[PDB]
Design a protein around this ligand. Sequence first.
Ligand code: HEC
Ligand code: NA
Length: 86
Amino acid sequence: ADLANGAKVFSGNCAACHMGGGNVVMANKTLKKEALEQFGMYSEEAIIYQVQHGKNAMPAFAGRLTDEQIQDVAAYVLDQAAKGWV
Ligand code: HEC
Ligand code: NA
């Protein structure tokens, strides 16, 4: 993946909800590593899935973002989570 492209994707499409790695809609479902691991979401393929199909209040991004942008944002989120948010 292109992590830098991911970050741009994130900025425009994900951070209105996941501001600085949080979650303004459902405050237990953050992008922090510990949180992701609690729900079996700390993997590229898990995130790609979720971004593609949505879940509840999280919008689906299928055929709004390209395949490459969805891969790249997933890779960005895991890499930010691993480094630490904010
Ligand atoms: C508000 C309109 C959101 C936008 C825009 C995006 N996400 Fe989201 N996300 C949101 C909610 C309310 C939830 C909880 C859904 C549920 O009921 O379980 C989530 C969850 C995720 C997760 C999982 C987090 C975890 O389990 O701790 C990930 C990894 C995730 N969201 C990533 C993400 C990406 C990369 C986004 C943009 C492309 C994105 N989300 C948008 C709400 C919202
Ligand atoms: Na990855």
